[PDB]
Structure formats: structure tokens, C-alpha cells
């Protein structure tokens with residue numbers, strides 16, 4: 001029993017965190033096999049950041065311009081290349097702590113653990129979701145660039161995010177491990193704004209199913225809805241549209257609790273109209289959207305209370 | 306920017322998690338040097354739990370009755386003893402991954418990271434506080450017994466909790482690493498209830514300072530109060546008393562934001578008698594009490610491990 005926002009154990013990832021220095025700039029890199037991955041903006045000055053020509057800045061660099069530090073050991077850089085917005089530094093030693101890994105690009109609504117690092121040293125781990133506007137609501141300070149987001153499904157680490165920048169509203173933007181940004185963002189200090197954010201509807205529904213499994217039923221009602229009527233109402237509250245794919249994904253939780261997805265959708269429409277009335281759901285006074293349907297099944301028991 | 310509930314990197318602890326089997330029971334153990342620590346109830350059947358005589362049950366066991374598994378390796382048990390509610394199993398091999406460690410007993414209000422394990426395998430990491438009623442609001446399933454709570458002090462791991470049981474309300478009870486329970490609980494299948502819980506006041510104040518640092522100032526007011534006047538309000542809303550020690554501990558956050566502790570207390574006083582009025586603080590509609598003053602300074606300064 002109990003439901004917590006839970007991150008994956010960060011051990012396999014901590015053993016990959018290195019410090020990357022290029023001139024006066026210092027950020028974090030990810031050491032996998034004989035390659036160190038880091039944001040390509042490590043080669044820029046603050047004066048270059050407005051309109052950088054990364055290809056032109058990179059061609060002017062040599063392997064000895066990059067200082068890579070793993071704990072108290074200097075790693076020797078023997079090659080450098082760029083893949084989209086990520087810089088790949090070939091080193092002379094394969095990381096003996098390299099876990100079984102994959103590079104995965106995630107869709108909005110998906111969750112992951114972030115190992116926040118400063119100077120190649122892990123300082124904290126937290127759980128978060130890729131927002132529908134492609135930003136992440138992280139907790140990042142100066143020097144956190146290069147920190148990674150991951151999922152550890154079974155014994156394999158799947159890397160899905162690398163931190164690059166903070167937008168003016170305090171939210172964060174980054175890339176997958178192939179250097180492709182999530183969202184309409186660029187690694188430039190030009191004016192960039194995150195689009196209007198919305199609530200991840202399928203995730204709130206999954207969290208309502210988790211509350212039912214944990215014994216909370218006060219919000220349930222005798223109503224059901226069409227999928228279209230649910231969307232007309234939910235979109236008025238800045239909720240993401242619920243697709244037929246989302247309904248299918250909630251199928252196992254619906255089977256386990258005995259509450260059809262469109263029946264749970266009717267509880268949600270009521271919650272958005274009535275508020276909580278001083279009540280809480282799983283210790284929260286807001287509807288929680290950073291738990292996917294897969295997270296709920298993984299965390300929760302197979303017997304409803 | 307950003308403020309998240311963040312756990313310590315779990316790496317140093319994951320390297321200590323082992324599986325302990327005694328007959329039909331399987332739970333987790335902590336392997337430090339040549340000793341494996343686990344709950345003493347691992348030696349009990351379900352009938353034994355009703356009223357156990359642990360010394361009598363233990364004297365009937367031999368070293369070969371305990372199966373200890375570290376990854377895919379069988380550890381040889383060469384001795385067994387009991388310290389309060391923890392069983393200590395002497396093994397032939399010292400853990401090569403043993404970090405620098407301490408065993409510490411924490412006070413209610415202090416926070417820690419929990420590495421939830423099943424079959425000696427870490428599956429999740431979350432942050433939580435020792436409640437004033439000595440229970441922890443964890444997220445635990447069957448087989449999580451023996452999972453540990455910890456903090457990191459520079460490069461030293463401070464072990465403060467070992468999971469033993471779940472109370473009927475879904476909250477959890479456990480011991481320090483010396484086998485001494487937190488709270489008026491016993492390791493026995495019998496009726497046990499958690500006392501009425503209170504809010505950790507100094508922690509809410511620290512979380513209000515974190516909101517100010519992050520730009521949330523709507524709750525600030527021109528007013529100030531006294532420790533006497535405030536503690537009358539605190540008693541009335543089931544809040545823990547605020548001591549002069551708590552005021553001193555909040556000193557650095559007070560200096561950084563320019564809001565005196567009794568000035569922040571008058572904001573908390575108003576939040577209790579009037580509510581949030583549809584507003585949120587750090588994305589929350591409730592006053593958060595699971596972040597200590599040290600946690601806030603650490604997350605707003607970028608301390609690494």
C-alpha cells in the first residue's frame with residue numbers, strides 16, 4: 001500500500017557521469033563504452049551563444065582542447081564529432097562501469113528519472129514527465145547541462161533525455177541522446193517561448209485508477225460519457241485530448257478495478273467541475289499527471305483494496 | 306529554477322542490497338563489510354508472528370538455514386546473532402562495494418531516501434520524512450522488508466531506517482540499523498495503530514523559503530508575529546511546535562531572501578486561517594512538510610555526492 005512519486009535507482013547512471021571542460025566552460029558528460037556524450041554548446045562562449053555556427057566553431061578545435069575528468073582521472077580524448085546538438089568525444093578508455101543501455105526518444109506524457117549533476121558529480125535524483133509542450137519541469141542550476149533522464153526497465157538503462165537549457169519561465173529544454181531536441185527549441189540564446197502547457201489526461205486517469213486500487217473511491221460516480229463529450233469538457237480545463245489509444249492503454253487498470261475508462265472519465269469531468277471540497281486523492285489536493293499507466297501497474301499491487 | 310522532491314543518488318546503497326531467505330520467507334538484507342543486516346522476523350512463519358519468542362526461534366537455526374544471495378552469487382553464512390529487532394548474519398566475504406558508512410538514528414521531521422527492494426534487487430528510490438507519529442508514508446509491497454533509508458554526508462552514507470511492516474492504514478513502520486523501532490511499534494502480527502499525525506512546521510517554513518527563492522511571493526505579507534503567538538496557532542491546526550532551534554536553523558534562508566522567520570510565520574499563520582484561495586505554491590495546493598531546511602539549501606546551492 002501507499003503511492004509515491006518514485007525514481008529509478010540511479011546507480012548504473014552515476015557510474016557514467018563525467019566532467020567535460022572546453023576552455024572556460026564546464027558541464028557534464030555521459031561516458032558509455034569509449035564515447036563521452038555532452039551538449040555541443042560546451043564549445044561556445046556567452047558571445048557565441050546568440051547565433052553559433054557549431055560546425056565552424058568545432059572545426060577550430062583539437063582533441064586536446066577538451067578536458068574530460070572521470071572522478072580524479074583525466075580521460076584522453078582521441079577523437080571528436082557532432083551528431084545534431086550532441087558532441088561525441090572518443091576517449092582512450094572504455095568505461096568499466098558501462099551498463100547495458102539503449103538510446104530511446106520518448107513522446108510527451110512519458111515519465112523518466114533525472115540524475116542532476118554538477119562538475120561530473122551526481123547530486124540528486126527526481127522523477128518527471130515530458131510535458132505536452134515538450135519542456136520538462138526540472139530542478140536545475142548553472143552547470144547542470146549534460147545531466148540525463150532515463151528509465152531502467154529490467155537490467156537495461158534507456159537514456160531518453162540530456163539537459164541543455166532553461167527557458168525564461170524556469171522550465172527546461174533538452175535533446176534525446178542522438179542530439180535531437182524535444183520541441184521547437186534550438187541551442188541558441190535567441191528569444192524562445194514554451195507553448196501553452198496542458199494536463200496529461202491519460203496520466204491523471206491512471207492516477208485515479210491507482211487511488212481506487214489503494215482504497216480511495218469518494219470521487220467515483222454513477223455516470224459514463226462518450227469519448228467526444230469528455231474531450232469537449234476536458235479541453236475547456238486545458239486538458240490534453242484523450243485518444244482511442246489512451247483508452248486501450250488504460251484497459252488493464254479498467255479490468256483490475258472494474259471501472260470502465262469512460263466511467264472513470266465521468267469521475268474526472270466531475271472532479272474538474274466540483275474541485276476536491278477539502279478532500280485529497282492519494283495525499284494530494286491537485287490532480288496528478290506525472291504517473292503513466294505503465295508506472296501505476298509497476299508500482300501498484302495486482303489486488304484492489 | 307524548479308523545485309522537486311529529490312532523493313540522494315542511490316548508487317552506494319544499491320551495491321549493498323542482498324536477498325535473505327529463511328525457509329519459506331524471502332526479504333532484503335544490507336551487506337556491509339562481512340555482515341548482512343535484515344529484519345529478525347525473517348525467521349518467523351505466519352503462526353510464529355502472532356506471538357514470537359525470537360531467541361527461542363533463533364537458537365533452533367543453523368548458519369546453513371539462511372540463504373544469502375548477492376546478485377547471482379551465494380554468500381556463505383558463518384555466524385548469526387540478534388541485535389534488538391535486526392538479525393546480523395556473519396558471512397565469509399567482505400562486500401567489496403562497501404561504502405564509507407555510519408548508523409544514525411534520526412528524529413521526527415528529518416528526511417531520508419528510501420531504496421525500495423524486492424528479492425535483493427533495487428526497484429525504486431524515493432524521498433520521505435519520519436513523521437512526528439514515527440511512521441513513514443512509504444510505497445511498499447510484499448517483499449520490501451529490509452529496504453533501507455539513508456542520507457549522504459559528503460562521501461559517507463548514513464543508514465537511518467530499515468523497513469519491517471505496514472500498519473492497517475497503509476503507512477509504514479521500521480527500525481534504525483541497530484534494530485530499535487521508530488515509534489511505539491513491535492514486530493508482531495497484532496493490532497497496532499499509528500498515533501494522530503501532525504505537520505512538521507519547520508519543514509513547511511523551509512518550503513515557503515524555497516518558493517520565495519523560485520519567485521512565488523503571493524503569500525508574503527507586511528506582518529510579523531512572536532514565537533508564543535504563532536505556537537498557539539500551530540497547536541490549533543495540528544502543527545508541531547516551532548522551537549528557538551528551528552528559528553536559528555532557518556537563519557541562512559532568512560538572510561538569503563530578506564524575510565525574517567517570524568515574518569514567514571505570519572504568512573503561514575494567514576495560510577492556515579484563510580487557505581490558498583485557488584492558488585498554489587510550487588505547483589502544490591497543500592503546505593508541503595517533507596523538505597527540511599538543509600534540503601532546501603542543498604537543492605538551491607547544488608551540493609554533489
Ligand SMILES: CS(=O)(=O)Oc1ccc2c(NC(=O)Cc3cccc(Cl)c3)cncc2c1
Nearest residue numbers: 041140141142144164165166187188189306
Ligand atoms: C540562476 S539560474 O537561472 O537558476 O541559473 C541557471 C543558469 C543556466 C541554466 C542552464 N543553462 C542554460 O540555459 C545555458 C544556455 C543558454 C542559452 C542556450 C543554451 Cl543551449 C544554454 C540549464 N539549466 C538551468 C540553468 C539555471
Ligand SMILES: [Cl-]
Nearest residue numbers: 105106107110
Ligand atoms: Cl514514449
